[PDB]
Structure to design on (684 residues):
């Protein structure tokens, strides 16, 4: 019953969704890679 | 008070007409003041000193708004000295009192309203980055201010994130005969050249450089003022097309400059009376000086720095910098004149040329690709005001700005444009090295043979308006004959989609409910939007069901999907690729397609080209090579890959 995303490139996760939204927390130390 | 001195060396448009109105206007700052004027002749230090001293006999609480017409540099300095040891604020307007001098003594009061060299460099960097050239050299010579020029340029380059390429700094200072000049000239290889010299030095440098060949058809010179004079006195050896910036004199006349000066003086007096309630005089004596020390009574220094006029604001700061100068950018004309493109009014340039005219220097693969947005093949996105650019990868395709009413004749506004074909175009550009002039077409749709005229895309190809029309084109027999197409790169056809979310059985058009337009019982659908491949193929092959559902075409594809969901009829004969992408990337993958992609006729897509264009064979070679090197699979997996494609 568990179909959690395996890897960020998962099409459910890679393509935008609307059930749950990704959280980066304070936009630092991750935002740099995301803009990269 | 306030006296103005002139004398009409060239422009005799003065006499008593200049001494008209002024402070009266609608200004609410009246006192014992007049608009006294004076005329003069060519200036010499003895004559100038005597005249200003004589005017000091009556200009007790007054000032001077002197202007000149010659090019003698020392005029500004002498004016500065007089202003220093007289305590009478003054301004400079035309010509001689218009070149800004670097430093002024603190015990002085005058502010010419020219423009700082640093302002010129900033505007020039702005225009250069606006055209996205970045890489440039800084050849110069020895002349005062060159060092601060270079340092300011470097610091401004480094203090931003747009990534200028700094290289090839040349500062030749050893005459123009040795090998150092030759090697320095030979070393540079960029297309953007920035020079800085003094009149004849610049012309000699350009005369030397033309013999090397750096003056071809793809080079620029952005010389800062320097060789501009005050008229169209360009030297004959200046080839053409020299980019420059200078102070404005055609959008600003002296008749308005004098008015602005009068208003500034009156407003300063009003501020002083509102803050000190008393304005003294300094009409003791011009001669016989060195009889009194400093007296800070009603210094104009704090009463001018933040002064506007009639809404318009031109407040100065520290030196003669006016914060908001009316700088104008000009180019050399074919007939050896100066053009007028763009005006530095706000922080935005507001240029007039969408593309560069490619001026003839002395006495080739960029083309115009035309496409419009449709499907997950070309996507239109608005430009981003924040960090103004087209995101990171989207390319600036400029749409013809569309409006309503009679003002629909809009300009060519930029937009950020991507899709499933832009990546193919850019990789083809990488492998072929061809530029682009992509702009949105808004005249119709993909195109069809209606009334013996093609509208949109292919029509341009048949009307000498688009050599290439890449996009979401569909290969057909009539289109390929008139438009030079290409080998298919994707598979496309006709597929039937049904919203049966509330086993395939019959796949295709071999059934009693589809082939026969009549009988059956429930109202079915044959929705096919006009100006497309589906309707043309249906009417060419089986022109029987089209008449039954002629008045059934949906407006677009989003409203088509809405009508498919909103149950009135569950049927759509559309493209196999678009329908497959929609089914794969649907909300829950509810609606599906009948059959396992049994396309009616798998014809695929094609790439447009001009009739007899010299690139078709190379285009086919590149397409087949990229078919070979396992990369279009990556492109499909990145863009058109679904979420339920693996799901059963």
């Amino acid at each position: 019953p568990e179909e959690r995303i395996t890897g960020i490139n998962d099409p459910r996760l890679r393509n935008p969704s609307d059930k749950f939204i990704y959280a980066t927390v304070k936009q630092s130390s991750v935002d740099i890679y995301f803009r990269r | 008070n306030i006296a103005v001195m002139l004398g009409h060396s060239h422009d005799v448009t003065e006499r008593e007409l200049r001494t008209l109105w002024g402070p009266e206007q609608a200004a609410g700052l009246p006192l014992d003041v007049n608009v006294v004027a004076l005329l003069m002749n060519r200036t010499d230090p003895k004559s100038l000193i005597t005249h200003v001293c004589d005017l000091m006999s009556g200009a007790r609480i007054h000032g001077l708004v002197f202007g000149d017409d010659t090019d003698q540099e020392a005029v500004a300095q002498m004016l500065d000295f007089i202003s220093s040891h007289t305590f009478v604020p003054i301004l400079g307007i035309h010509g001689g009192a218009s070149m800004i001098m670097a430093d002024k003594d603190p015990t002085s009061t005058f502010f010419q309203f020219g423009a700082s060299i640093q302002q010129q460099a900033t505007v020039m960097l702005k225009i250069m980055q606006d055209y996205d050239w970045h890489v440039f050299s800084l050849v110069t010579t020895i002349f005062p201010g060159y060092r601060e020029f270079i340092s300011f340029v470097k610091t401004t380059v480094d203090n931003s994130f747009v990534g200028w390429d700094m290289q090839n700094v040349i500062t030749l200072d050893t005459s123009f005969e040795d090998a150092k000049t030759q090697v320095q000239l030979k070393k540079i290889h960029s297309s953007v050249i920035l020079l800085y010299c003094s009149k004849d030095e610049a012309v000699l440098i350009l005369s030397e450089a033309r013999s090397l060949g750096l003056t071809g058809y793809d080079f620029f010179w952005i010389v800062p003022s320097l060789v501009s004079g005050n008229t169209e006195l360009i030297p004959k050896e200046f080839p053409s097309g020299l980019i420059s910036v200078s102070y404005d004199d055609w959008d600003y006349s002296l008749e308005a400059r004098v008015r602005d000066g009068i208003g500034i003086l009156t407003t300063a007096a009003s501020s002083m009376l509102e803050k000190f309630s008393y304005i003294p005089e300094a009409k003791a004596s011009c001669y016989g000086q060195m009889e009194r020390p400093e007296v800070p009574m009603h210094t104009l220094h704090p009463f001018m720095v933040n002064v506007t006029w009639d809404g318009k604001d031109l407040s100065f700061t520290e030196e003669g910098y006016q914060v908001h100068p009316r700088l104008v950018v000009i180019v050399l004309n074919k007939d050896r004149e100066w053009e007028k493109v763009g005006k530095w009014e706000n922080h935005t340039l507001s240029l007039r040329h969408a593309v560069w005219p490619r001026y003839k220097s002395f006495s080739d693969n960029h083309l115009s690709i035309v496409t419009l947005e449709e499907a997950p093949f070309v996507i239109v996105e608005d430009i981003d005001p924040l960090t103004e650019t087209c995101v990171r990868n989207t390319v600036p395709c400029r749409k013809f700005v569309k409006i309503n009413n009679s003002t629909n004749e809009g300009m060519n506004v930029k937009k950020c444009c991507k899709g499933f074909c832009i990546d193919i175009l850019k990789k083809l550009s990488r492998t072929v090295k061809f530029t682009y002039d992509l702009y949105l077409v808004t005249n119709g749709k993909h195109g069809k043979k209606v009334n013996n005229v093609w509208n949109g895309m292919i029509g341009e190809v048949v009307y000498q308006r688009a050599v290439m029309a890449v996009g979401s084109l569909t290969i057909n027999e009539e289109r390929s004959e008139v438009v030079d197409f290409s080998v298919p790169f994707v598979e496309t056809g006709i597929s039937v989609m049904v919203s049966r979310s509330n086993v395939d059985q019959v796949t295709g058009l071999s059934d009693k409910k589809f082939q026969r337009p009549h009988d059956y019982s429930p109202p079915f659908r044959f929705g096919t939007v006009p100006n497309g491949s589906t309707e043309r193929n249906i009417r060419n092959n089986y022109p029987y069901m089209h008449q039954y559902m002629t008045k059934f075409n949906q407006k677009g594809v989003e409203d088509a999907l809405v009508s498919l969901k909103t149950g009135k009829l569950d049927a759509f004969i559309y493209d196999a690729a678009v329908l497959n992408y929609k089914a794969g990337r649907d909300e829950g993958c509810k609606l599906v397609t009948i059959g396992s992609g049994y396309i009616f006729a798998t014809t695929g897509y094609g790439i447009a080209l001009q009739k007899g264009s010299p690139w078709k064979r190379q285009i086919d070679l590149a397409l087949l090579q990229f078919v070979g090197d396992g990369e279009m699979e990556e492109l499909e997996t990145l863009w058109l890959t679904g979420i339920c494609h693996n799901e059963k």
Q: What stands out?
A: The two ends of chain B are 94 Å apart (CA to CA). Chain B touches chain A through four residues (CB under 8 Å). Chain B is about 25% helix and 10% strand. The longest strand of chain B covers residues 412-419.
